[PDB]
Design a protein around this ligand. Structure first.
Ligand SMILES: Nc1ncnc2c1ncn2[C@@H]1O[C@H](CO)[C@@H](O)[C@H]1O
Ligand SMILES: Nc1ncnc2c1ncn2[C@@H]1O[C@H](CO)[C@@H](O)[C@H]1O
Ligand SMILES: O=S([O-])[O-]
Ligand SMILES: O=S([O-])[O-]
Ligand SMILES: O=S([O-])[O-]
Ligand SMILES: O=S([O-])[O-]
Ligand SMILES: [Cl-]
Ligand SMILES: [Cl-]
Lengths: 226, 226
């Protein structure tokens, strides 16, 4: 825990159980009936639950646990992760953080991932002994305080434009760089924290693409055998 | 169609409708009843269908359409794709090929992706006019013949070890390099074609990780503004 590592936060993520406001919406009730599950225990998924989101605040961007899934598959299966050069976290839109042990094997199947998220939200930590995933009430600033990095970067389409290769070289100049990528499909961050905004392209990209550019660019600097 | 581009083939992919042999397996019948769908029309998914795979040849590696989904999300959302430097194809374990127009927006949600695959397998091309996805009976060699590349690389854990950065530099020395990545979770390729085997790491990696390493490494060579 003294070697250089990237601390990557997928932040303001659209990962939540079904909003209390819409628990009785027919599309929710029908879905939960079919799944034989209590609605309040179910992970919100706009693919199934869109009809119920029409009237919800930010309804159009909520319920995107797919973004976290694909980001985490990309991050945890990375060479950077295997070389013990990555720590990854999820901060959700409702100010919960998920801590992930680096050795975690995330379900490749999305539906199995959702099942895992349902278990995590219910029990607070999974599995019982290992606690490969652990969740608690926490703001993005509180998380950053815990990491105590020497620099915070916020990946932002409007930030300082950098060639991805060059951003990797920049990250390798720090001991404990934190990079924040939004876990939401469009719009602004909800959590304004101090950090350096960095663009890698002058068009919007998906979170997983940004994850890949950052991780791969860093890999080729920080792993001396590369 | 004269600029350098990477032609990326996700090959021998575990993407198929339910095997004829197991259509009457209870786990298949129950699943298809629940989905109100004809079993033969359903995409095989080991997450739901594993009980029926126990006795099938290669049962343990079949029904992994998740691998294709995550590979294609990674490929199509890439900067390389946006710069018109990528052509991507799927060749399946049953000798079908899927051609993908570069502008295709793949469903981010896995279950919506499966629905799209069901439609594609049924109709041969989707959507009706656009034909962003098109499928036909075809071997991997026949596909390579169509591409007519100046080099074929086969990403293989046992191949010539290369630093990913350096493989990108190598790819940029060709006009029309084809790269093959297996779309199967473990084991050997089924389709032996002529090509140069390249390892990027001396441990096994998932297909999507290899996809990211290849695409990102190439990007930083082939896109002159990088
Ligand atoms: N062009 C871009 N450069 C850098 N980060 C980006 C870009 N497009 C999107 N992102 C990041 O991905 C998230 C999801 O699109 C955004 O909240 C942001 O963190
Ligand atoms: N270490 C590796 N180097 C290169 N390609 C690999 C490696 N591990 C797996 N692959 C590729 O990913 C596919 C799925 O693991 C394999 O069939 C192969 O194409
Ligand atoms: O059955 S309820 O606890 O999901
Ligand atoms: O990893 S499991 O979801 O196939
Ligand atoms: O209803 S059957 O055609 O899937
Ligand atoms: O892109 S759709 O699957 O959310
Ligand atoms: Cl929540
Ligand atoms: Cl098939």
């Amino acid at each position: 825990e003294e070697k250089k590592r990237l601390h990557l936060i997928i932040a303001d993520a659209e990962l939540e159980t079904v909003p209390p406001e819409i628990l009785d919406h027919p599309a929710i009730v029908n879905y939960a009936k079919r799944r034989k599950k209590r609605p309040e225990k179910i992970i919100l998924d706009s693919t199934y639950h869109h009809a119920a989101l029409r009237q919800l605040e930010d309804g159009e961007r909520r319920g995107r646990p797919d973004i976290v899934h694909i980001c985490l598959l990309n991050a945890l299966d990375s060479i950077l992760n295997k070389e013990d050069r990555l720590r990854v976290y999820v901060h959700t839109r409702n100010d919960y953080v998920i801590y992930i042990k680096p050795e975690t094997r995330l379900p490749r199947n999305y539906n199995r991932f959702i099942g895992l998220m349902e278990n995590l939200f219910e029990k607070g930590a999974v599995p019982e002994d290992l606690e490969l995933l652990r969740m608690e009430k926490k703001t993005l600033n509180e998380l950053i305080e815990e990491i105590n990095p020497d620099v915070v970067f916020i990946m932002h389409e409007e930030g300082e434009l950098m060639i991805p290769k060059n951003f990797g070289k920049l990250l390798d100049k720090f001991k404990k760089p934190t990079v924040i990528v939004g876990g939401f499909p469009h719009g602004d961050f909800k959590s304004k924290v101090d950090g350096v905004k960095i663009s890698l392209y002058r068009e919007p990209l998906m979170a997983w693409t940004i994850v890949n550019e950052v991780i791969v660019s860093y890999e080729w600097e920080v792993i001396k055998k590369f």
